[PDB]
Amino acid sequence: MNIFEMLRIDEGLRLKIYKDTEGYYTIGIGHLLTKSPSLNAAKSELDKAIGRNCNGVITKDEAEKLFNQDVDAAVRGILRNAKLKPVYDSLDAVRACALINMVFQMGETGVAGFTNSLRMLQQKRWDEAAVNLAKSRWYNQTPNRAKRVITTFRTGTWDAYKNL
Ligand SMILES: [Cl-]
């Protein structure tokens, strides 16, 4: 298991434009297109992103292209973040992927607000951090996903993803 397989499990893969859990226009492997309610605006962003006339749809290879780009951005993001970097550098591999997972899903700015969880993760207070992590809109809105990620932070293993 690696970050790509992990995210693939959490985001699924859709070739036509879809509304995500928050009702936002997205496609591929959780590639957010736009926060606006406009399908056309989403269609525009899709074309701009792919660099061709797609008319709301893409291929698997293009999806994977967005995907590779998005994963890289999250990492680069974390590494550039004053608040995220120290935590990220402090984690073992497996746990680091979980941080990437959250950033991919919510953005670096959103994750940077889990101040207390962040500190706990920094201190290696696994169980304590898992509890704090659960006291969030994140967990209340996407419970099964949030559970997998928290379990990962708690155990340092891929178990939450085994057998899926
Ligand atoms: Cl969920």
Side-chain angles (χ1 to χ4, degrees):
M1 180 92 24
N2 57 63
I3 186 60
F4 291 96
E5 294 170 330
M6 189 202 207
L7 283 165
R8 174 63 220 290
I9 283 149
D10 291 329
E11 303 277 3
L13 189 241
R14 324 224 353 180
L15 304 189
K16 17 105 59 242
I17 284 172
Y18 65 102
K19 274 174 193 254
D20 66 3
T21 69
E22 323 260 12
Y24 298 138
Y25 284 127
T26 302
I27 199 177
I29 299 155
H31 184 81
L32 182 219
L33 292 159
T34 187
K35 277 206 218 160
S36 234
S38 175
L39 178 49
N40 291 117
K43 262 147 111 124
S44 175
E45 293 289 337
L46 172 60
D47 293 333
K48 172 158 63 90
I50 293 299
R52 114 171 122 70
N53 261 43
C54 303
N55 188 40
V57 0
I58 72 183
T59 72
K60 157 155 46 252
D61 293 285
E62 249 147 23
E64 321 188 303
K65 227 204 247 149
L66 268 18
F67 195 33
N68 273 315
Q69 282 168 12
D70 287 347
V71 164
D72 182 68
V75 180
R76 299 306 301 270
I78 280 160
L79 287 178
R80 268 201 276 92
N81 194 290
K83 320 74 111 221
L84 311 160
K85 195 199 179 291
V87 176
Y88 184 81
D89 286 344
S90 86
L91 309 164
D92 50 271
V94 181
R95 287 190 181 81
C97 302
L99 189 54
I100 292 169
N101 200 303
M102 288 181 83
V103 176
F104 183 101
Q105 193 191 355
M106 86 191 22
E108 94 179 47
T109 166
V111 174
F114 282 57
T115 308
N116 302 314
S117 301
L118 292 185
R119 237 141 297 311
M120 276 161 342
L121 288 162
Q122 228 192 319
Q123 245 131 62
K124 302 207 195 285
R125 298 148 159 261
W126 315 129
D127 275 70
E128 292 157 56
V131 164
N132 188 263
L133 273 163
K135 306 203 254 166
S136 63
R137 185 207 218 230
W138 175 51
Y139 176 97
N140 284 93
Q141 296 310 124
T142 55
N144 285 101
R145 196 221 179 113
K147 281 183 196 169
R148 288 191 288 275
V149 173
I150 286 161
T151 284
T152 304
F153 274 126
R154 213 191 28 242
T155 68
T157 72
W158 290 111
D159 304 322
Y161 294 87
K162 215 258 135 138
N163 236 212
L164 238 170

